[PDB]
């Protein structure tokens, strides 16, 4: 089938994060008709990882970009982390729709450095993402 559309807002907000460090994170979702990827929520420049986690639905999928900052250790390194949040409680149709569209949204974001697929509270936890991003 045709590739899903990706709103220009997705790229616009991603570049604000990647370039301006204006937003700590961006959460994207498939619109109601599953015809376009759109921005749902953005975090402030200083939002925390726990702030981000509190935005994730327990029973639906999301895409997200998190500008992950590691602990200071000879300077402060960061990693642009792309996350597919696919909780097991999500309906199978949702899980399959977000799987099908993942490439499309990734292809539109210039500068992803790390990719995480998380399905439960442990795989989305900061410790798990940190280790995957350190890596
Ligand atoms: Ni196709
Ligand atoms: Ni903004």
Curated annotation (Swiss-Prot):
Top-level taxonomy: Eukaryota, Amoebozoa, Discosea, Longamoebia, Centramoebida
Subcellular localization: Cytoplasm
UniProt xrefs under CDD domains: ADF_cofilin_like (cd11286)
Gene Ontology annotations for the cellular component aspect, listed alphabetically: actin cytoskeleton; cytoplasm
SUPFAM superfamilies: Actin depolymerizing proteins
Name of the protein this chain belongs to: Actophorin
Top-level taxon in the UniProt lineage: Eukaryota
SMART domains recorded: ADF
Organism in which the protein naturally occurs: Acanthamoeba castellanii (Amoeba)
């Amino acid at each position: 089938g045709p590739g899903i559309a990706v709103s220009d807002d997705c790229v616009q907000k991603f570049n604000e994060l990647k370039l301006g460090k204006k937003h700590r994170y961006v959460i994207f979702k498939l619109n109601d008709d599953n015809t376009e990827v759109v921005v749902e929520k953005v975090g402030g420049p200083n939002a925390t990882y726990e702030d981000f986690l509190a935005q994730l639905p327990e029973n639906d999928c999301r895409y997200a970009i998190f500008d992950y900052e590691f602990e200071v250790d000879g300077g402060q390194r960061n990693k642009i982390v792309f996350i597919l949040w696919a909780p097991d409680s999500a309906p199978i149709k949702s899980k399959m729709m977000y799987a099908s569209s993942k490439d499309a949204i990734k292809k539109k974001l210039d500068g992803i450095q790390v990719e995480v697929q998380a399905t439960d509270a442990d795989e989305i936890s900061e410790d798990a993402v940190k280790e995957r991003a350190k890596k």
